[PDB]
């Protein structure tokens, strides 16, 4: 039940996630999952970085739900629930600005 998860905002634009992930004590990897603005049926996880060229900024990661039943980002790494997808790139950065490292206050 991912409206039970702490790191579900639900129904927030893309400006806001941004606005609550550019905060400067936000460590690398701070994330949160919301809706797509405009993709039925997808999610979007937003994921602070931070480097010496960007200094703090955002990325934005479109995970899709099959009706067959995976949850992804890439079709060829894909999960039984949205839970397992957020476990796995908590340890795993894969093609992400970072790993998963904290949700997003």
Do not use: M
């Not at 905002?9 to 949160?32: C, D, M, Q, V, Y």
């Not at 603005?37 to 010496?52: H, I, M, P, W």
């Amino acid at each position: 039940s991912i409206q039970a998860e702490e790191w579900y905002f639900g129904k927030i634009t893309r400006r806001e996630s941004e606005r609550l992930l550019l905060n400067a004590e936000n460590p690398r990897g701070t994330f949160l999952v919301r809706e797509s603005e405009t993709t039925k049926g997808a999610y979007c996880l937003s994921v602070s970085d931070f480097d010496n060229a960007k200094g703090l900024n955002v990325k934005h990661y479109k995970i899709r739900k099959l009706d067959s039943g995976g949850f992804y980002i890439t079709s060829r790494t894909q999960f039984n629930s949205l839970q397992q997808l957020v476990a796995y790139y908590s340890k795993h950065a894969d093609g992400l600005c970072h790993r998963l490292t904290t949700v997003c206050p």
